[PDB]
Subunit: 118 residues, 6 copies
């Protein structure tokens, strides 16, 4: 078994609407978000790879454009943009064009994140 | 499933008591230790998260104050303070208060660590 | 000569109001900003330090709290919140309470920043 | 169960022979490679570890010396030196001298790599 | 005084011609090179910046393309491609187009590097 | 002007003898300490360098061996081993064997350090 992964970062704004009154996350703020796409599958004997890294980047690119330098709450499905909802949403957007996807990781900060799978 | 993780670092001294005579780990020394706490669970449809990262941080804290800026060998159960032993010890202290705990990782140095699960 | 520094991270939203329209920075977005404060001065023979790292952390606190998990455009003096303007703005808030401040570095992203001095 | 891991970096050149003529990986180039060896086993009740980190390092050394500061295409088995092939290859060199080995990870760049377990 | 900086990484092979016979840098190998371009200048009142990060990026591009996924020794002026020689050579390419340039840093590996300032 | 730099890390214990009664630094503890040595001089036309990175690693080794996996307080001159004192102390050990030394930086934690320059 072989797993490949590629990391991306994007700069965005968000706010959490269902947190308690005066919770710091309920104010408009932002992060440099780290996402990791992980894919599992067979290695081709000839090319020596599961899929070209550049090909994983290209598949993620339209989702990436929509996230980077944007305000996440304005994206349908992200109206509650926690790390967990974000990772599921990314899975849902990318799984159909990367059928070998087996994990998506979202880090909001250098110290805290989330991993979504199947 | 969805996993959450939060990272902490604490600064401590320790010594390994059972290593051979010349061994550098037998001398009083210290490290910047890194701990990752991992938990696995259901995402609440309303809050959009498993628990607040800050809840996690708050639960580890009593344990954190005991490790940070201390000499590990003086803590009961850490009298042989390897990473393997520390990881299990941290699991035993934190699992009772975070039942969703699914792994603890401890890194002594930037290049070396271990993961205790179940 | 001896210089000390301490690093801080805060999560915030901002947008640049004087970019041509269509410029990515003109949209509401965010970053995990890193700030480095740098002081220069005489080491006390008794304490062995210039001042305590925690004293530096404490003098920065009221400024830190205005920036962390906030929208920077709403802070007066920050209506054009570029890295350059922000480093100056922080200098200006922090120099009165830390007279040995010799530099302020602001990093918007992991790959890009600014340093302000004197 | 408990898992131990150890990280190494080696500096190397390589080119991919089976990419289309345009492709940038077909040019002679290089990377600071990162490799992680992962072992899973029983923690000895006296030593308090699975095996010494230093032992894992000493076992990887001969493989390490072949990789470091070398051109990978000249190494038998690495004539198509992708991340995937490197992972499996390292697995193959290392599993016989470290039977606890449970994963090998190779990172070609900071944001991209691959995990192998047989 | 304000300084701004921007980091880039590129993947390249090289080798050193003037080291003694068994020296490891004399073998064909590679690295993930890191370069930091630094500029110093006045902050414009309207833009709030010295120049856009993206402008510094665009000026460096023709030079960056020559370096990434290439063999350094084949580039004229880089037949002895040490960090020191690389740093000066980048300065020499970029300085004429970016007169505000005040420093070029190169790092071959995570822990070693060089800074050229004219 | 050209400057070259090399980073090292060592694992050590210390405590601060001159902090008030309850100060956490006054307890026995430890750090992964990072040290950067910086040197400044002329690049030899033939070697393409100031000195070999490995040469600087060799000049620092006897001093490095005294710090790594050791209790700093028992080293003469380090009875009060703050970052400031340690950076001056390392300068003092390293200057006589590296006349081109222009800076020593010491970092105790990931986010706080000291730079001493003569
Ligand atoms: C910035 C941070 O306060 C906010 O983004 C936040 C706070 N707590 C959180 N907690 C969880 N579990 N998930 C999150 O995304 C999350 N997010
Ligand atoms: C500093 C380091 O030598 C010492 O803490 C050390 C050395 N070797 C080790 N080896 C293992 N397996 N686990 C450890 O915690 C460990 N720990
Ligand atoms: C998001 C980022 O592109 C935007 O914040 C941005 C773009 N270019 C920039 N350029 C400079 N010089 N300073 C900035 O703060 C800056 N900031
Ligand atoms: C340099 C880099 O472009 C080249 O080494 C490259 C490109 N795409 C890749 N894609 C995969 N899947 N694996 C690789 O090792 C890989 N390797
Ligand atoms: C990779 C490394 O072994 C080799 O490239 C190397 C070794 N020692 C060096 N020493 C100096 N000063 N500069 C270098 O670029 C340098 N470069
Ligand atoms: C571990 C940390 O609490 C302790 O070593 C500490 C605390 N505050 C400090 N403050 C200064 N200025 N220098 C130090 O070395 C220092 N060192
Ligand atoms: Zn947030
Ligand atoms: Zn140790
Ligand atoms: Zn921005
Ligand atoms: Zn490559
Ligand atoms: Zn090299
Ligand atoms: Zn300390």
């Amino acid at each position: 078994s072989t797993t490949l992964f590629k990391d991306f970062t994007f700069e965005a704004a968000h706010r959490l609407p269902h947190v308690p009154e005066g919770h710091k996350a309920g104010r408009l703020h932002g992060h440099s978000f780290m996402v990791r796409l992980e894919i599992t599958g067979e290695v081709d004997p000839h090319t020596g790879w599961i899929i070209d890294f550049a090909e994983l980047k290209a598949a993620f690119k339209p989702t990436y454009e929509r996230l980077d330098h944007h305000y996440l709450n304005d994206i349908p499905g992200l109206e509650n943009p926690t790390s967990e909802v974000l990772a599921k949403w990314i899975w849902d957007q990318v799984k159909p064009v990367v059928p070998l996807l087996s994990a998506v990781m979202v880090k909001e900060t250098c110290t805290a994140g989330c991993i979504y799978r199947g």
